[PDB]
Ligand binder design. Sequence first.
Ligand SMILES: NC(=O)C1=CN([C@@H]2O[C@H](COP(=O)(O)OP(=O)(O)OC[C@H]3O[C@@H](n4cnc5c(N)ncnc54)[C@H](OP(=O)(O)O)[C@@H]3O)[C@@H](O)[C@H]2O)C=CC1
Ligand code: SF4
Ligand code: SF4
Lengths: 80, 111, 383, 208, 114, 303, 176
Amino acid sequence: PLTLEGIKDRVLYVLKLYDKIDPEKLSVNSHFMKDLGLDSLDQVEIIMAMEDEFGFEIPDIDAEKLMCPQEIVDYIADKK
Amino acid sequence: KKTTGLVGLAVCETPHERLKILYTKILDVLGHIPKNAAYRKYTEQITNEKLSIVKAEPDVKKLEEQLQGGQIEEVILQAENELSLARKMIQWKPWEPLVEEPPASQWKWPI
Amino acid sequence: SNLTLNFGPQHPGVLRLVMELSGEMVRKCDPHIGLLHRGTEKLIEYKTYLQALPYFDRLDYVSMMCNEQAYSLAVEKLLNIQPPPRAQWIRVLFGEITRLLNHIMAVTTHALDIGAMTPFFWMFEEREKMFEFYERVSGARMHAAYVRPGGVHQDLPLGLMDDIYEFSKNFSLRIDELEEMLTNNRIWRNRTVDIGVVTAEDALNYGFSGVMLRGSGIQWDLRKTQPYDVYDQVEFDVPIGSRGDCYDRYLCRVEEMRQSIRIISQCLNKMPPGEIKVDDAKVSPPKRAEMKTSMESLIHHFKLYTEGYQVPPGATYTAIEAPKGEFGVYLVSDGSSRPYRCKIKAPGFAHLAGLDKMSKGHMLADVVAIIGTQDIVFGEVDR
Amino acid sequence: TRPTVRPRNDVAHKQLSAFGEYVAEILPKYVQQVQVSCFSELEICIHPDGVIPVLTFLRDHSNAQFKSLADLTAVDIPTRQNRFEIVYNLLSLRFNSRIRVKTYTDELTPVESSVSVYKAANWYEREIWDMFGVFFANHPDLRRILTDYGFEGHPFRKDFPLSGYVELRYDDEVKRVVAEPVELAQEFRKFDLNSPWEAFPAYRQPPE
Amino acid sequence: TSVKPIFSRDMNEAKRRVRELYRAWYREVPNTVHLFQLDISVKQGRDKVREMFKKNAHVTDPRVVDLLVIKGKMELEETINVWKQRTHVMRFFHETEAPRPKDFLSKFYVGHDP
Amino acid sequence: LHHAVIPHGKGGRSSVSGIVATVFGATGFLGRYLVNHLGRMGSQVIVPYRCEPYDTMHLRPMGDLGQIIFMDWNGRDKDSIRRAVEHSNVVINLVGREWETKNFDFEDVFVKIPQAIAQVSKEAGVEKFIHISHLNADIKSSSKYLRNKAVGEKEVRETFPEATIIKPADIFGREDRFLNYFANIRSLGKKTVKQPVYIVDVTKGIINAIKDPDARGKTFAFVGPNRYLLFDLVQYVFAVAHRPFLWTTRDKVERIHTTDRTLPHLPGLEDLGVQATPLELKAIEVLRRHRTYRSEIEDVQPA
Amino acid sequence: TYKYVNLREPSMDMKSVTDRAAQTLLWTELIRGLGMTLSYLFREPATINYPFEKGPLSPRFRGEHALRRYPSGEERCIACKLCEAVCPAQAITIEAEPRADGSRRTTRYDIDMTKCIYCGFCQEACPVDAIVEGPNFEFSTETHEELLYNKEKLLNNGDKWEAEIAANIQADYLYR
Ligand SMILES: NC(=O)C1=CN([C@@H]2O[C@H](COP(=O)(O)OP(=O)(O)OC[C@H]3O[C@@H](n4cnc5c(N)ncnc54)[C@H](OP(=O)(O)O)[C@@H]3O)[C@@H](O)[C@H]2O)C=CC1
Ligand code: SF4
Ligand code: SF4
């Protein structure tokens, strides 16, 4: 049942489930670090939350080079 | 003799030839050391003197009490340790000149 | 996985031990020690020499005069003072008395830590007489300072050596009765023979000192190799262990008690009537009659107790054969009236370092026997 | 000079002088000061790049056994760039000799961690890490020995004060032991005891 | 000033190790707050963990950040073991301060306090 | 004020704050927490006790070295009470047992105890007398307890006019009466609004009222931030206590079935200035002792 | 000089091995240990009855120090602060004022018995022998307030006995 649009929707609802994101303002070119103004602390929080929900081990250099929700979805489609 | 005093040191059976092949290995690995260092001179001096003491002994207790180092198998462990540092001092190049000096206002004590 | 027990500070000394054991026969034990941490080194750094002498009296607490002797010989070694001969002989006599005390407490507390109850009571009656001797000599029950750097302070009163002679005879009979009671006692031999073997190579690399070196082969006595005092004039021999057993180490402690009896006998028979303290008013305080009817003695008393004597700058490390082993003190002194930094080598600390190799292939009652079989007081292990 | 003055020996002094010269000849790379004091104990003052070579040489080499290790400390000296002084205190068995290998370091430098060539240095190194603050690289375990877990500050420095910053007390609000800033009941009167008049002329440093 | 390092070469490995340690502290809190039977929700614990990481934010030297990583890893090992008790983990928090204010005026009514 | 009544430095543990508090009762629950916060302040607490010295031994190591002091008293003699308030900066009245005895009743504890102590503290010449009373203490019926506390409020308002009458709601804490009374049971289902308030907010309010004047004379009321129904409170405390389950006097059950109401004609916490806390945090704190091993936060919040 | 032990072999002579077997089977030495315990059973107990027989001591015992005073005269102290200078626990607190006569004296001489390690350095540092470590062990105090001795508890404690303290000093003033 694993389709890429379901991957994008599931990353979408777990980012909505994350509480500290203010406001929602979600897209594919969202770029939640500088367009939305959050710390790299929040970057590693989000990527380990992906790891906790449905991810692989997701090593920290690949975790650092994501920076974008559609690119998170595309990395999930890459490794799965 | 049988069951010397040290606990985890089980007794030997052939002291003479074992200690001789130990010191031939010492002189070999020391032969791979460079020449103008003092370390080759002092080690080769003391090891040739010790081996030359070993060369002419028919007995065991006479070699124990005559050659210093005391007990007979501690000499063998001591020889194995000196071979280990000879292998280690092929590396580390200690005969090179001094590594970079301290700020030189340091080793005076009374502050 | 495996059972990670947490032995807390209850009594089986006082520690915490986390043992990742396999199945009644262990795997990986770790002593968390430091629960009795006091701050002795920082406190001695902010105090003077004479004032911080009781810290060296009580950092180890079962031995009470050998630690004083080690610190006082550190200061007398750095300060270039030979003590007078009668001070040296009284220091030797009380070193042997404290050695007898520490070995007999180690024997009795190891017996009670296994579970045998009665020779504890017997030999503590004997140690009650030991403390009566300490009371009559100094005035304290246990923590007699009494050993100034500059010799023995305030010599023993008239009528003591006869009591020490009576105590020598009766104590020889009582230690013979202890060997009568235990020692070929079958269940105790079954309790401790093959537990805690120590190779002499590991005894040198793990830095074991004193009784562990006697038990594991190699002959090593500070009293025989490096005579730091008049030990070269008294004749005694040290016991050596053949096998690395705990039973062997028990036999070694009992025979060190017996050799302490010999040294006490010869020290009573060869006492010289020299003098109490040194012939220098600038280090030892002058006596009270000369203090009152003398000007310079009052000035030296006043300055020697306010400022204290100064120490020339330098660093030294001395170590003496305390009953636990090489009790070491490393003084570093800027030229001043306070020491700059002192540090203590504890034989109990060095012995507790090798607890892994002493309890790798045995069970947990044997772990309690290993903790007991080394005279570890957990106040000296802290530094 | 005969009564109550400690008689020094010159045989041990000459032998330790000759042996210190011999050690500094055979290890030219790491040796800076070779000093013998008046009471004949050897001290070798050492750059912190040769702790493993000097101690592997000194545990072996059969002309200086030095099997046993004692005190390790790194006496916390201000006024310098490199503060700490690590003192390996080596005791022989075949020889009855004592040498002190004193290497220097500052606050932020790994020395080469002698735990592999002296198994006694395990808790010594861990204790010096906890109390002073000198990190030791390529070392199995560094934890906090002789201190509380919630306590930090590396207290044996001269910069850490005598009384600590935290102080424990039980309270019934949260029904447990809590840490509060220190409110002493007495001052700890520091005495100004260091009198003038230069009690040793032989230790006068030359002035500017 | 060719200084020997601890672990790193510049601030890049420093940032990598501190984000690894923050990931470990993030996944290490709820186990401990279930284990030691504390009284504080998981979100407040995570907020004070990230506050402890935001406290040292002006540190720039790579050796210093390496040594702070070593400190945090030691304390995370001592908290993932059961060695530290309830007292020390509550001692990380501050419930018994009755905290002193920072305005000049209330520092003036309880004075001698610069 | 003489010297050694001026404050010095920081707070607590031989840090001299500027009040000397004579604290009546103080052996039970609320007095022990108030002595805890005064020992945290670093004051001098004169506690009188009529009981065994073992209970004041259990509350003993709170204050610092000789800060708190112990003395005996009775409910019969004015001389011991005047000896208790010989020299005191402040005095607080916290007394009253929730059940009758053979020597002291609900009658005249709340009439004969506060009149005597207020009379001798006015005649001794102290200021800032703080008296606690229960909320909804009215002349209207259904509790001897509550009508006696209403007579007590009127009498302590009549004599000593510059008093601080302060009234909390049904306070809950670590060693509570009514919430622990709920957990120790076996029950009925009705509707009654009731607002608990946590004890450390109440005693922070008391210490702010005791060291922060402009609040003298005015009576205060403590209102918790919840104000919800009793039935869902019982089901929430059973759900957090992990037990389903679907001295017990008649006065106690009528107190827990009295509808606690609030009037904003007297100011609450914000005009005094301390934050209030909701139920659930401290409820998960106090509700231990579930089962052998054994969140679902209800949060009814009616009206 | 070494005297090493644990060196015997099991003798294959029949008498030695049958004696070791008899030891193993017939329980010889365990009954021998029972005989030793019975030998201490039939002794007299080496106990003392405490509340009627207080135990023995020494004439230089240290504990419960108090201030002496002159024979038919004033206080013996000077407030010279030698004892405060030498006190290793730093327990002494001296504040000095002279009275109207002109002799230098005190106002405050406070000792914490809680901090006091009981050395004897304030016994031996005093030039006029004002403070002397007393004879006894009678503290057993219910409160932490009461173990902080003022000058007047010290003077009542030095006036509760001088005959004891003068007898101990007259016994032992020729050693120190
Ligand atoms: N539900 C609650 O807890 C609420 C309580 N309050 C008030 O809080 C106060 C304390 O209540 P609480 O701690 O819960 O219960 P307690 O009954 O245990 O506290 C009362 C204190 O006064 C003492 N005391 C009571 N009656 C007498 C008497 N006749 N003679 C001498 N001493 C007496 C008590 O016992 P002892 O004699 O041993 O010292 C205790 O020290 C009361 O005045 C109550 O009205 C107010 C609102 C809510
Ligand atoms: S040393 Fe003696 S005279 Fe001096 S202050 Fe102390 S008690 Fe008084
Ligand atoms: S005996 Fe007590 S009061 Fe006297 S010097 Fe020692 S600690 Fe101070």
